[PDB]
Amino acid sequence: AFLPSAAYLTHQQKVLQLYKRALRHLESRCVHRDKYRYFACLLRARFDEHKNEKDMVKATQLLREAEKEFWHGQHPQPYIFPESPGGTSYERYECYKVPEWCLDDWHPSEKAMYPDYFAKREQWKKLRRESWEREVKQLQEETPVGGPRTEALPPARKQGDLPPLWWHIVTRPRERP
Amino acid sequence: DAPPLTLEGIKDRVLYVLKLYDKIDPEKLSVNSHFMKDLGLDSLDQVEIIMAMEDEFGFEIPDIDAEKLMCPQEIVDYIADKKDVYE
Amino acid sequence: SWDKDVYPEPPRRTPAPSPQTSLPNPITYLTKAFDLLVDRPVTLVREFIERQHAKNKYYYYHREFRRVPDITECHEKDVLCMFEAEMQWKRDYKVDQEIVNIIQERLKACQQREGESHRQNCAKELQQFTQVVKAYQDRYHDLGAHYSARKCLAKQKQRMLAERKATKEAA
Amino acid sequence: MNLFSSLTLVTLILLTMPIAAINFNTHKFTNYPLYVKTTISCAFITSMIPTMMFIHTGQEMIISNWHWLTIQTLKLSLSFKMDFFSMMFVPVALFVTWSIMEFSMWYMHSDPNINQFFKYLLLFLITMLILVTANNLFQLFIGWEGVGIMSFLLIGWWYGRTDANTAALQAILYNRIGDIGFILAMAWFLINLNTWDLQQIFMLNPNDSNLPLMGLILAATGKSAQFGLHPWLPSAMEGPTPVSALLHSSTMVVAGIFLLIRFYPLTENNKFGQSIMLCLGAMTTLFTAMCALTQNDIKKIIAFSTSSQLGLMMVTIGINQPHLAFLHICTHAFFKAMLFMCSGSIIHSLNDEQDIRKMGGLFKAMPFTTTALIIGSLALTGMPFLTGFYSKDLIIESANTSYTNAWALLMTLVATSFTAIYSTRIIFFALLGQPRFPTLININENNPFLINSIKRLLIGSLFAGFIISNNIPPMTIPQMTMPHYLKMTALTVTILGFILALEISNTTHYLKFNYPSNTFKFSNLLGYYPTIMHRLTPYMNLTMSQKSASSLLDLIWL
Amino acid sequence: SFPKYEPSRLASLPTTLDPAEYDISSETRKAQAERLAIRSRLKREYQLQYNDPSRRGVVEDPALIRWTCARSANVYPNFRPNTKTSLLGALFGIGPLIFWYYVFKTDRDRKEKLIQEGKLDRTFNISY
Amino acid sequence: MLKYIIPTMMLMPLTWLSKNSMIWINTTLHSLLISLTSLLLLNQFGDNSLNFSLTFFSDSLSTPLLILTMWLLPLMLMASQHHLSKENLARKKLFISMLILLQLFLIMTFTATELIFFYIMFEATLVPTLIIITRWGNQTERLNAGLYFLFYTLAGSLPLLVALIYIQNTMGSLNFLILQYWVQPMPNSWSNTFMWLACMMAFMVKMPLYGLHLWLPKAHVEAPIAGSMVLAAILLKLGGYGMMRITLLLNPITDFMAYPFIMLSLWGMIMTSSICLRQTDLKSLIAYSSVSHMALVIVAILIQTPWSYMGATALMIAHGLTSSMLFCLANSNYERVHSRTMILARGLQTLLPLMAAWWLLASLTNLALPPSINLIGELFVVMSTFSWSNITIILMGLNMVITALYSLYMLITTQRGKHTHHINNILPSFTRENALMSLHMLPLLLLSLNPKIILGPLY
Amino acid sequence: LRWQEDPEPEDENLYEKNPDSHGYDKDPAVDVWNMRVVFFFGFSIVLVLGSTFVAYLPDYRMQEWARREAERLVKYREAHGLPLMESNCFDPSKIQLPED
Ligand SMILES: CCCCCCCCCCCCCCCCCC(=O)OC[C@H](COP(=O)([O-])OC[C@H](O)COP(=O)([O-])OC[C@H](COC(=O)CCCCCCCCCCCCCCCCC)OC(=O)CCCCCCCCCCCCCCCCC)OC(=O)CCCCCCCCCCCCCCCCC
Ligand SMILES: CCCCCCCCCCCCCCCCCC(=O)OC[C@H](COP(=O)([O-])OCC[N+](C)(C)C)OC(=O)CCCCCCCCCCCCCCCCC
C-alpha cells in the first residue's frame, strides 16, 4: 500500500496487521481485562482455524471477508494510545522540539553560560563535516543506476567511517524536552 | 512523576513480561532468544508479544517495526530508541 | 460639583441602622478601618494639593458665541453670511446633541436610582426624553453625512408644508 | 458608599497588576504563579466586602467613571454595573480561579512556559470580569471577544499539535457565529433605542423585541454551546486540564447564559423568546447528555456534562426564571471545576491517560480524588442538600409547575436521568472495579497544592448552595405547592437513571459480545453532527473559495 | 449478509475494503516498484541536500514552486471562453449580486413606503 | 500646510548631501521629527475646518490621513533598508527620493482646497509609486496588469478630469469650501448618471472595488516592502477621501446610484475574505484582506450617514496601520526564507516568540478585536448599514466570521504547528524588525484610548 | 551555452561578523547609532510626547464646551418653563412657504 521499504503488503503482513487491529478494536469493545482475555483466546482460535490454508487465492478471499467482518464489528472510537497518532497527547511536545542548529544562532554571552556543552558541540560538528564527504562518496558508488530502488540506506562499512545520512537521526530532539 | 527508563529497567520489564507467558519457558529464555527459531513461536504469538509490550510500556509500536522485532534485545533497543535512555 | 437643576437628584432617604441580632457585623469595623487607613491620608494629601491650588488662583472662561444671522435671512450663494449661519447652525447642532445626552444621563440615573420601581417613579424623565428625542428627530434626522443648514431648512420647510396641508385637510 | 465602589475597582486593578508585572520583567521570577495565585486570593478577599455589604442592604450601583467617547447621542463611558449578578459572580469566579491556579502550580509544573500560562489565565479572568460587570453593550463586547480570544490561546496551548490549533479555530468559528447575533442585538438597540447602556434599554422597555432577543439567543448559542453551535466545547478539551476546568466548564461557557440572564426584563415580556430559549435549551440538554452516555475520554464526558448543564440553564431561563439560572451558574462552578480537577489529577497520576477504558481500581489508590469525584458527581446529579440540589431541583420544581412546553419538560427529565447515568459511568469505569492502566504505577497525589485546591472547592461543593441560597434575596416567588408525584420528580428520575446505568454497567461483566446498535453508533459519533458539518461546510466554502471566487471571476473574467 | 460500506466525496473507501489493493499480478508489482523507485530517488535527492552541512538555507522544492505557480500564474493563459466557462462565470458571477440586489431593494422600498406612510416605529431613532 | 511641505522637500538635500553610511539615519531622524511636527494639525473645531490658505485646508478627515502619511515615511525607511544594502548608493538615494516625493505628493493631496489640484496631486502619486514598484520589485511579470492599468486610465481618472472641468465651468469653482455653500442637487438624468460614474469610478478603482480589485494582489506582490506599505496604508485611502469629498456634489442621485456598487461590495467582502482562505501566497492573502476591508469603506461612504463616515475614516486609519504591519511581518519572514509561500515556513513560534507575539497582535487587530479602532470602525459601519437595511447584518456578520477565519489561519499556518525541517537560516529577530512592528502596533493600540481624533469631521 | 553572468549572491548573515547587530547596518557603530536614533526619536519623542500632546489637546472639536453650554441652556429653559428643544431649528415666523 504505502511503506518505506516494501512497495506492498505481503499476505502474511496483512494477516498479522488484521489480527492486531482486530484485537485492538476488540479490546476497545471489551473493556474489562478477563473478559477481553477470554474473547482474545476465542478470536485467536478463530484466526488459527485457517492458519494452515495453502491456497493463496482462497486465503485472499478469506482475508477479504475477514476485513468485512472487522469493518462490520469495529468500534467507532477505538482506544488510541495517547502519544499514538489520534491520541490526546499525540505530537503535544512538538512545540518544544527546537532544532539543534538554533544553538548556532545564540549570542556569545549565553554560549559562555554553558562552556563545556558548546566546546563539545564544536567537535560534534567537526565530526559531522569530516564524515560528510566520505559518506557521500560511499553512497555514490553503491547506489545503482537510476537512483536507489528502496528508501533504506546502507550502514558504515569501513572502520572509522560513520553511517550515511546520520546527523538528523542522531541529533534529533528528545521526545520530552 | 514520569520515571526515567533504563536499559536494566527496560530489559528486566520485557523479560518479566515474557516470563509470564505460557508458551515461553522461564529457563530457556535469554536476552537473545529468537521468537520463531529459538523459542518456537508463531508470528501470531510474535504479534501478541509486541502487543504485550504496548500494554506494558504505554505506547504503540507500529506494524512496520512490529513485523521485525524478533528477540527481546531488539525490543529493548527499540524502546531505547523511542524513549532516549541513558542521557 | 455641578448644577443640581440640570442634573436633578431627589432628596436621599436612608434608613437608620437597626441591629436586631447580637452578632457584630463586619461592615462597621471595615468602615472604621477604611475611615482611618484610607479616608484620612487621601484627605490630607488632597488638602496639601488644595493649599497649592490656593497659592496660584487663576481662572478660565466659558466661550460665548453671539448670535449671527441664520440661514433664512442670508442671501442665496452669498458665502460670507451663510458661512456665519452654517457655523452658528453647527454649534447649535453639537449643543443640541449634548442636551440629548444630558436627558439620557438623567433617564439612566433615574432608572438605577429607583431600582425596581423605575417604571412607576421615572415617568417624568421618560416623558422629557420622549419630547427631546421627538424634537431632535424633527430637527436633525435624515439629513445625511453632508448635512448643512440648507438641508435642515429644507427639511423644516417640508415638515411645515406637511403640517399646513394636515391643518387644511382637517377643515 | 465609599467602601463599595472603591473595593469594586480595587479588585479589577489588583487583577491587572500582575499583567504589568509580567510585562515589566527583567529577572527570572521568584515563583510568578504563586504571585498570581496570591493576587487572586487577595482579589477574592477584596471582592468579599462589596458582596457582604450588598447582602446587608441590597446596595447596587453604577460606576460610570471614565468618559471615553461621544458619538453624537451615544456617550460611551467606562461603566461598571454592580448588581446582584456581579456581587454573586465575582467572588465565585475568583474563588474557583484561585483553586484552579493552586491546581495548576502542580499540574502545569513541567511546562517551561508556565509564566505565559498563568499570564494567559489571568488575562482570561480580567476579560471575564470585564464581561460580567459591563454596563453597556460595548464593554460587554470587549469582555466577550476577550474571553473568545483567550479561549483560542488556551485551547491552542500546545501549538505544535495540529488538533489543538484545529479545535481553537473551531471554537473561534462558532463563537463568531454567535457574535453575528450579538452585533445584531447591538445594531437593533442602537437604531431603535439609541443606546447600548442597559439602563436605557430597560427603561425604554421595547415591545417589538423579537429580533434583538433572537440576536441574543444566537449569541448565547455561540457562547454557551447550545445545539447547532455546540461541538466546539467537546473539541476544546484538547487544551490543558486547568483550561478546561476554569474556562470551558464554569467561567467562560456560562457567559451566553449570563448574557440572557442579564437581559431578563426583555425576556420576561416576550413569550416567544422564552419559548425559543426553552426549546433550544431542552434540545441541547437532551443531545449532549445522550452523547455523554457512550464516550470514553473523561474530559469529553465532563464537557458534555457542562454543556448539558448549560442547556438546563437555558431551559430555566426559558421558563422565565432567570435568578434560578444564575444561582445554578454560581452553584455549578464549584462541583464542575472540582470534577475537571479530579479527572486531571487522575490523568496526571496515570501518565497522561484520559481514556476511561484504561482506568479503574482508584478507590483506594487515589482516596481524596475518589472522595471529591464522588462528591462532585453527587452534586451534579442532585443528591439531597449538596450544592447542586439548591438550584437544579428547584429548576425542576419550576419546570413542572409552569405554563411550559411539555416535550421540553419531558426532554429535561430525560436529561436529568442521563446526568445520573454518565456520573455513575465515570465512577464505574474510573474508580470502581479492577485496574486497567499499565503496569508501572506512578500513582500519587500527596502535594498540598493539589489537595488544598481540591479541598476548597470541596468545601464549596458541600456548603456553597446552602450559604448562597440563604444569602440571596427573593426576586421571584418560589412555587412551593405541587402534588407529591410532582415534588418527588427530579429525585426519582435521578435514582431511576442510577438504577438503569448500574444495570448497564453490570451487563458489561458478562462474557457476551454484541454487535453495535444504531443508537450506540449515533451517540458515539456525536449525533453524526461533527462528522458531517465539519466536512461539508468547509468543502462547500473552500472549493467555492477557489474555483469561482479566485480562479474564474477574480483572475480571468473581471 | 453484511452492510457494504458506501464511499462518498467526503467519506472515502478504506484501503482494506478496496478490491484493487488485493492485486497480486506482476504488472502491479512493476507499478508499485516504479512508484517505490521514484519515491526513493526523490527521498535521496532531498536528504542529500538536507543533511549537507555546507548548505544553510532552504531546500527548494520544485513541486511546491510548481504548485504555487499553478495556483497563481497558470490561470489566465490556459483559459478558453466556451459554453461551460461563460455559463459558470454568469451563474456565480452575476447571480448572487442580482439576488442581493433585489432582496435589499425590496426591503428598502418596503421601509421607505412604511416611513412615508407614518407606519415604521422610528420613535427613538435619532442615531443613523 | 507649508510648515510640512518645506521640511518634506528639505529631506531631498538631506538625503543627497548625507554621507554614505548616514543616509538612513538622517532621513529616519528628520522624518520622525516631521511626524512629531504633524500633530499640530489636531487644531480642529466642532464647526469650522482648519483653513490655512487659498490652496490648503484640513478638516478632521484629512488630518489623521496626514498624520498617518507623515508617520509612514520613517517606517518605510526602516523596512526597506535591509534589502537595499547591496544596492548602489546613488540608486539607494533615488529610492529614498521617490519615497520623499510620494510623501510630498500625498501631504498636499489630502489638504487640497480645490478639486483639480486634488486631481493633479492624486494622479501625481502614481508615478513615484510606479517607479518604486517596477525598479525595486525584485521580479516584474506584468503581462495582464498593463491592460488593467489601461482600463484604470480609461474608466477612471480621465472621466474624473472631464467631470471636474465641467464642474469648473458650471459652478465657477472647484473650491470645496465654496462647493459646501453653492452645491446644487444633482437630479435624475442620464447626463447626471454619466456625471456620477465619472465622479466615482476613479475612486472606485482606487479603493479597490470588488471586480475592480484585479490589480491589487498583483501590485502588492510585485512590489518592495515600502511600496506595499504605502499602497496598503495610504494609497487606497485616497479613493475614500476623494469619495467623501466628491459625494457632496452627487446628491441626491447617489441615493439611487449607490445600489449596484453597494451590492458589489456587500457580496464582494464575502468573496475576497473567502479568497483569503485559499491563498498560497501570504502577501496576496493580505492584499485580498485589504480588498475585504475597503469594501466596508465603500459601503459606508455610499450610504452617507454620520455613523458610516465616522466608521469609515476610523477603519481607514486602523486598516492602514494594521495591513502595513501585516506586510512588514510577511517581509520579515520573506527576508529569511526567500519565498512568499505561506506553507513553506511553519511553526515559527518555536523559533521567534516575540515575533509570534507581534503576529498575534496584528492578527487580533486584523480580525477587529475590541476596543481597537479596527473594531470601532467595523462596528460603526455595521451599525450604519443596519440602519440602511436590517438584512445586511447577515452579510456583515458572515464577513465577520470569515475575517476571523483567515486571520488566525495566517497565524496558525505561519507560527504554529511543526517547524519546517529543511529551513535552517531562520535567524533571531533583528531589533530593527521588532522596532518596526512596535512602531506599527503601539500607535494602533494607543488610538484605542482616544479614538475621537480619528472619527472624521462629523464626530 | 548562455551568456556571461555573475552568480547569485548568497544571503549574508548580519550576526556572523557582528553578534550584537541590531539589523540596521553592518557597520556596528552605524548600527548602534541607527538603533539609538530610531528608539529615541521614535519612542522617546514621538510616542511619549505625542501621547502627552494628544491627551492634553485643548478641547478637540469643542465637545466639552458643548456639554457645558448645554448645561447652561437646559438650566435656562427648565427654569423659564420652556420645552427643552423646539421641533423647528429656525423661527417659523421668518419663513415664507410656497402657496398653493
Ligand atoms: C498613554 C499612556 C498609556 C499607558 C497604558 C498603556 C496602554 C496600551 C499600550 C500598549 C499595550 C500593549 C503593550 C505590550 C504589547 C506589545 C509588545 C509585546 O508584545 O510585549 C511582550 C512583552 C512581554 O512578553 P515576554 O514574555 O517578555 O516576551 C514576548 C513573548 O516571547 C511572547 O509573547 P506572549 O505570547 O507570551 O505574550 C503576548 C501577549 C498575548 O496576549 C494576547 O494576545 C491577549 C490580548 C487579547 C485579550 C485580552 C485583552 C482584551 C481587551 C480587554 C482589555 C482592554 C480594555 C481594558 C479597559 C477596561 C475594560 C473596557 O500580549 C500581552 O500580554 C500584551 C498585553 C496588552 C494587550 C493589549 C490588547 C492587545 C490585543 C489586540 C487589540 C485589542 C484591542 C485594543 C486594546 C487597547 C488597550 C489600550 O511585553 C513587554 O516586554 C512590554 C514592553 C513595553 C510595553 C510598553 C507599553 C506602552 C507603549 C506606549 C508608549 C507611549 C505611551 C507611554 C506609556 C508607557 C507605559 C509603560
Ligand atoms: C500605579 C499606577 C497609578 C498611578 C500612580 C501615580 C498617581 C497617583 C494616583 C492619582 C492619579 C491622579 C488623579 C486621578 C486621575 C485623574 C482624574 C481625571 O479627572 O482624569 C481625567 C479623565 C476623566 O475623564 P473625563 O470625563 O474627565 O474626560 C473625558 C475626556 N473627554 C471629555 C474629552 C471625552 O481621564 C482619566 O481619568 C483617565 C483614566 C481612565 C482610567 C481607565 C482607562 C481605561 C482605558 C481603556 C481603553 C479602551 C476603553 C474602551 C472601553 C470604553 C467604555 C466602554
Ligand SMILES: CCCCCCCCCCCCCCCCCC(=O)OC[C@H](COP(=O)([O-])OCC[N+](C)(C)C)OC(=O)CCCCCCCCCCCCCCCCC
Ligand atoms: C492619528 C492618525 C494617524 C495614526 C497613526 C499615528 C502614528 C503616530 C503616533 C503619534 C503619537 C500617538 C498619537 C495617538 C495617541 C493616543 C493616546 C493618547 O493620547 O491617549 C490620550 C488619553 C486621554 O484620556 P482622556 O480622554 O480621558 O483625557 C482626558 C483629558 N485630560 C487628560 C486633559 C484630562 O490618555 C489616557 O487615557 C491616559 C490615561 C492614563 C494611562 C492609562 C491608564 C489605564 C491603562 C490600562 C491599564 C490596564 C487595563 C487592563 C489591561 C488588561 C490586559 C490587556
